[PDB]
């Protein structure tokens, strides 16, 4: 599962990662709270999954752009511009 993750998502390409990232940090973060999801139905590893999932995602966008150039000044700027244009919507399982 761990060693697979590069072989998984280094294949999916940037504009695929947007909706992947957002769907990850959407539901299985947010929807699992609310009442802590059905009171005996946390599966608290899910918080362990998504937190580590999205962090592995965001590296790939970042670590790719180092090879191109960018260098953390432009990166922060385009993170604002991207982050500025989002619109939350119902996650999967709803």
């Amino acid at each position: 599962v761990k060693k697979e993750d590069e072989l998984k998502e280094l294949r999916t390409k940037t504009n695929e990662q947007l909706n992947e990232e957002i769907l990850q940090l959407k539901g299985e973060l947010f929807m699992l709270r609310l009442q802590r999801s059905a009171r005996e139905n946390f599966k608290p590893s899910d918080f362990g999954r998504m937190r580590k999932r999205v962090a592995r995602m965001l590296t790939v966008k970042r670590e790719r752009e180092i090879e191109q150039g960018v260098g953390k000044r432009l990166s922060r700027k385009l993170d604002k511009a991207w982050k500025r244009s989002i619109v939350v919507r119902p996650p999967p399982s709803l």
């Binding site: 959407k26 947010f30 609310l34 009442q35 989002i86 939350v88």
Partner: peptide, 18 residues
């Protein structure tokens, strides 16, 4: 240019239950 301070997608922590 929308948010006073940009924050997140996230925002909402939880509903209050009382």
């Amino acid at each position: 240019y929308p948010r006073r301070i940009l924050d997140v997608y996230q925002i909402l922590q939880s509903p209050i239950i009382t």
